[PDB]
């Protein structure tokens, strides 16, 4: 009768969420100043890649950015003068994640080879070389995020996230219980919790130190492709394969707002927030990115310069730019 | 500060002389999926398998590490030139499970330009599996080969040719000329299987160019 009592437990959380549900924020934020139409023009355009670009991560210096494409190249750009600082070749041609270290010294990438590699780029001996590869996953890697210069969390396609250690190559903790390809992850500002969306329409809050699960959010109806995090640490947004972004608050354990329109039939592939958390940038499959307001769902601005898809998107730590990589091998920096 | 910008463009143009050298070796190698298996029916003769026919580099990749669900990693093979779809001809209705995988590759939003090369393997064990199949497909008893010829037995020829026309009903229903299917039969005589992909990938580039020039 373990499944029979689970319906009593699942209906216990459902009616408890109606106890805290008093008014949606669309009725609360009805007395705020709207932002209106914004216009982002393409400032720079980094043209150095030969295949589809699957991930970029902006460095914490707000100057450099790493991008990864599926021809076996990891190019560290310089977003002010469009100069290629480095151009690393990879062992596997199919990569779908990349990450810049918050000290600037390291860079990471993984893909269909089930291996997170680490490349040390601030070396005084020679050129860039692979530091240590992390092979413990039985599925493709989807997202990589550095905690410090010694710890990294990697989500994979074998339903399990994993906190690693760069020294000795061993997994410190592990996170199980998604039942779906974990497609992305994010990180907290204080770096003690992290969320992870997967292919079972369920984002899931975790714990780095304890290695346990805190909460589980279920409001989507298809596979979750991207996730981000609100800058204060109290909420996160989540885009899925059904043209809907939903803002979940992790202190009321339910949704706040749903960002959708009538004439959008594509899916989200990238979600990020601004610096003040007022604009929500979302990349789509019909080649253009929309700029949703976070409080109202007013659909402020549309930026369109791409050709084949929009696969990745990022906002700098000072909020001065937005770079959208795409499947036509061109990064474009918007401002 | 002035010497820092001179050191920046010196490191820039050194990279540009390597990216343009790597571009001409990237556009000279043809990538290939292999969505069958490494079952040595068409695998030991030909993840990275690299061969070379007529001084052309081919890049065949058998993806095996992924577990069951392919709806997220198969869309990273949309810049490929062809998908090789090795499938055994001869329980639990293993043929219809491949008939629905081919129907899903053909109708994807991203693999709707890739042209499948279909290998109908396990051919030498089909003659033993036909003389004892027809209950799984009731239209097999009412079907006859119209005009094709040049195969042993007439019962095993009609049984083999029924499987090939089962795939072409899907391949000729929503193609619109952007991609075709290239069915073949092979069984352990796979010395003439490496050139069979070479002659088929040559026709994929030619029909790609002729349709761009509005000649097909």
């Amino acid at each position, epitope marked *: 009768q373990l499944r029979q009592e689970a319906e009593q437990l699942k209906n216990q959380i459902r009616d408890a969420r109606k106890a805290c549900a008093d008014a949606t924020l669309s009725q609360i934020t009805n007395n705020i100043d709207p932002v209106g139409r914004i216009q982002m023009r393409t400032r720079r355009t980094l043209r150095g890649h030969l295949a589809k670009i699957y991930a970029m991560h902006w460095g914490t210096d707000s100057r450099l950015l790493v991008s990864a494409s599926q021809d076996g190249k990891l190019i560290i750009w310089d977003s002010y003068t469009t100069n290629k600082v480095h151009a690393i070749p990879l062992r596997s041609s199919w990569v779908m994640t990349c990450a810049y270290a918050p000290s600037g010294n390291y860079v990471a990438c993984g893909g269909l080879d089930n291996i997170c590699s680490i490349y040390n780029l601030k070396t005084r001996e020679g050129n860039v070389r692979v530091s240590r590869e992390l092979a413990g996953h039985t599925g493709y890697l989807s997202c990589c995020r550095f905690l410090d210069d010694n710890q990294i969390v990697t989500s994979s396609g074998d339903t399990t996230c994993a906190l690693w250690d760069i020294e000795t190559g061993q997994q410190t903790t592990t996170f199980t219980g998604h039942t779906g390809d974990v497609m992305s992850l994010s990180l907290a500002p204080d770096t003690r919790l992290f969320v992870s969306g997967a292919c079972d329409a369920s984002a899931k809050l975790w714990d780095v130190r304890e290695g346990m699960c805190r909460q589980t959010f279920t409001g989507h109806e298809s596979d979750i492709n991207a996730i981000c995090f609100f800058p204060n640490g109290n909420a996160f947004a989540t885009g899925s394969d059904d043209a809907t972004c939903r803002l979940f608050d992790l202190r009321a354990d339910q949704e706040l707002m749903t960002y959708s329109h009538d004439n959008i039939i594509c899916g989200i592939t990238s979600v990020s927030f601004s610096k003040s958390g007022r604009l929500l940038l979302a990349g789509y499959d019909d080649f253009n990115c929309n700029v949703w307001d976070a409080l109202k769902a007013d659909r402020a601005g549309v930026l369109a310069g791409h050709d084949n898809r929009v696969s990745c998107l990022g906002v700098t730590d000072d909020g001065m730019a937005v770079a959208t990589g795409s499947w036509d091998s061109f990064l474009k920096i918007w401002n | 500060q002035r010497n820092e910008e001179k050191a920046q463009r010196e490191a820039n143009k050194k990279i540009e002389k390597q990216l343009q050298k790597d571009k001409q070796v990237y556009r000279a190698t043809h990538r290939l999926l292999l969505l069958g298996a490494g079952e040595s029916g068409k695998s030991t003769i030909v993840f990275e398998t690299k061969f070379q026919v007529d001084k052309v580099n081919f890049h065949m990749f058998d993806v095996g590490g992924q577990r*069951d*669900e392919r709806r997220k990693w198969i869309q990273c093979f949309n810049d490929v030139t062809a998908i090789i779809f090795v499938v055994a001809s001869s329980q639990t209705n293993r043929l*219809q499970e491949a008939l629905n995988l081919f129907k899903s*590759i053909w*109708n*994807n939003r991203w693999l709707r330009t890739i042209s499948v090369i279909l290998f109908l393997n396990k051919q030498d064990l089909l003659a033993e599996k036909v003389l004892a199949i027809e209950d799984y497909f*009731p239209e097999f008893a009412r079907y006859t080969t119209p005009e094709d010829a040049t195969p042993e037995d007439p019962r095993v020829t009609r049984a083999k040719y029924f499987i090939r026309d089962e795939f072409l009903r899907i391949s000729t229903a*929503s193609g619109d000329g952007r991609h075709y299917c290239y069915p073949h039969f092979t069984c352990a005589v796979d010395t003439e299987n490496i050139r069979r992909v070479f002659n088929d990938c040559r026709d994929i580039i030619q029909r790609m160019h002729l349709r761009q020039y509005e000649l097909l």
Partner: nanobody, 126 residues
């Protein structure tokens, strides 16, 4: 929270009739293509039939052609499989799967296990 709850089934005589119904809550029913997947004891999962998101296209496994049928009702969100002329080789657990994405022509459907959009399955035996 998505839900695919099936009903019907039971132990009948070989040659009778059955009607399974699948009530779906949590998603818009009108814009997904639905499926019926059975699993025989000892065997893996095996696809049976499907239906498009409006009722136009309807396909079957050839081994169940003529006997079975499949219908939708997009106003009450229920998926039906009317079964006639059963057989001792038809005893299976019948799941009610669906497409992973809306407005989508293809589907990458049922696996070894752990497909995210599926029901518990009602036992059907003869």
């Amino acid at each position: 929270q998505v839900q695919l709850q099936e009903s019907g089934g039971g132990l009948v005589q070989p040659g009778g009739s059955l009607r399974l119904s699948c009530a779906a809550s949590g998603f818009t029913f009108s814009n997904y293509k639905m499926n019926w997947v059975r699993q025989a004891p000892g065997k893996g999962l095996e696809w049976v039939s499907d239906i498009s998101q409006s009722g136009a296209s309807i396909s079957y496994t050839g081994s169940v052609k003529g006997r079975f049928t499949i219908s939708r009702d997009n106003a009450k969100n229920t998926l039906y499989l009317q079964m006639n002329s059963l057989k001792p080789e038809d005893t299976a657990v019948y799941y009610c799967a669906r497409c992973p994405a809306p407005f989508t022509r293809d589907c990458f459907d049922v696996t070894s296990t752990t497909y995210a959009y599926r029901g518990q399955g009602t036992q059907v035996t003869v």
